[PDB]
From a paper:
Systemic ATTR amyloidosis is an increasingly important protein misfolding disease that is provoked by the formation of amyloid fibrils from transthyretin protein. To investigate the relationship between mutation, disease manifestation and fibril morphology, we have determined the cryo-electron microscopy (cryo-EM) structures of several ATTR amyloid fibrils, which were isolated from the amyloidotic tissue of patients with hereditary ATTR amyloidosis. Based on cryo-EM, however, we find essentially the same fibril structure in all patients, demonstrating that the mutations do not necessarily lead to different fibril morphologies. Each molecular layer consists of two discrete density regions that correspond to two ordered segments of the fibril protein: an N-terminal segment, extending from P11 to K35, and a C-terminal segment that spans from G57 to T123 of TTR protein.
Each patient was heterozygous for a different mutational variant of the TTR protein (V20I, G47E and V122I, mutational sites refer to mature TTR). The second patient is a woman (TTR G47E) who was diagnosed at the age of 56 years. She suffered from carpal tunnel syndrome and severe cardiomyopathy and cardiac surgery was performed six years later. For the three fibrils we obtained spatial resolutions of 3.18 Å (V20I) 2.37 Å (G47E) and 2.99 Å (V122I), based on the 0.143 Fourier shell correlation (FSC) criterion. The site of the G47E mutation is not seen in the 3D map and located within the internal disordered segment. The most abundant proteolysis sites occur between residues F44 and S52 and thus within the internal disordered segment of the fibril protein. The internal disordered segment is not seen in the 3D map, and it is partially cleaved off in the fibril, as demonstrated by MS. All three fibril samples contain both mutant and WT TTR protein. A superposition of the three structures shows that the fibril protein folds are virtually identical. The backbone root-mean-square deviation of all 92 resolved backbone Cα atoms was analyzed with Chimera25 and found to range from 0.5 Å to 0.7 Å for the three structures.
Numbering used by the authors:
A (entry chain F), B (entry chain E), C (entry chain D), D (entry chain C), E (entry chain B), F (entry chain A): 11 to 35, 57 to 123
The structure:
């Protein structure tokens, strides 16, 4: 008998992020997985992935150049932070 | 008999991030996994991944260049930090 | 009889990050794993990973160059730090 | 009979980071593992990993250069430090 | 009968980082492990890892150069240090 | 009968880092281990690790150069030091 009980009696007003999981039992392969339940990706780069079988196999002249040079600003006040009875502000 | 009990009686208003998991039982392979339940990726780079079987196999002239040179600013006030009855501010 | 009991009676308003896990039982391989439950990756780089079987196998002329030279600023006030009845501020 | 009891009665408002785990029982291989429950990676580099079987096998002329030279600033006020009834500030 | 009891009665508001684990029972291999429960990696470098079987096997002319020369500043006020009723500040 | 009891009655607000573990029972191999429960790595370098079986096996002309010469500053105020009713400051 598997019994899982989470946050059953709540009185008041909290801030929650519940993640309950119960399990009873050619280049990239994945199986039976739970990924990115509460994930966050900011300014994330992937230039060359899984190009394929036999890419640039013979006599390949290639110049890979990657220039990440910029005036980019990211300002997050409450990233993944539940809060109760509080004050959150970004003042520029 | 498996019994798991988490945060059953809450009185008041907290800030919570619950992650409850119960389990009863060609180049990259993964199986039976739980990844990035509460992950965060900021300014994350991946230039060449899993290019493939036999890439650049014969007579390959290649110049890999990666220049990460920029005025990028990241300011996070409460990254993954639940908070109760508090004050959070970013003042620029 | 397996019984796990976590934070059952809470009175007041705390700040919590609960992570409860119960288990009853060609180049990169992984199996049966729980990774990055509360992970954080800031300015993380991966230039060449898992290029593949037989990469640059014969007569390969390659110049790998990686220049990470930039005016990047990262300022985190509460990184993975739940807090109660407090004051958090970034003042620039 | 396995019984695990953690933080059962909490009165007041603390700041907690609970990590409870209970277990009852071609180049990189991993199995049955729990990694990075509360990990943090700041400015982390990995240039060449798991290139593959037979990489640069015959007559390979290669110049690996890695230049990490930059005006990058990282300022973290409460890294992985839950705090209660406190004041946290970054003032530039 | 295995019984583990941690922080059962808490009165007041402390700052805690609980890590409770209970267990009842081709180049890199790992199995049955718990790694990086509360790890921190700042400015961590890995140039060449697990290149593969037979890398640079025959007649390989290679120049490995690694130049880490930069104006990088890291300032952490409370790294892995839970604190209660305190004041934490970085003033530049 | 194995009974482990840690920090059962806490009155007041301390700062704690609890680590309770109970166990009842081709080049790098590891098994049955718990590593980096509260680890910290600052400016940590690894140039060549686990290159592989038969690397640079025949007629290899290689120049390994590693130049770590830079204006890098690291300032940590409370590294792995929980503190209660205290004042922590970095003033530059």
């Amino acid at each position: 008998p598997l019994m899982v009980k989470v946050l059953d009696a709540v009185r008041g007003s909290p801030a929650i992020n519940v993640a309950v999981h119960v399990f009873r039992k050619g280049l990239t392969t994945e199986e039976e997985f739970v990924e990115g339940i509460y994930k966050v990706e900011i300014d994330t780069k992937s230039y060359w992935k899984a190009l394929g079988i036999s890419p640039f196999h013979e006599h390949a002249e290639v110049v890979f150049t990657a220039n990440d040079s910029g005036p980019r600003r990211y300002t997050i006040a409450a990233l993944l932070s539940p809060y109760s009875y509080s004050t959150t502000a970004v003042v520029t």
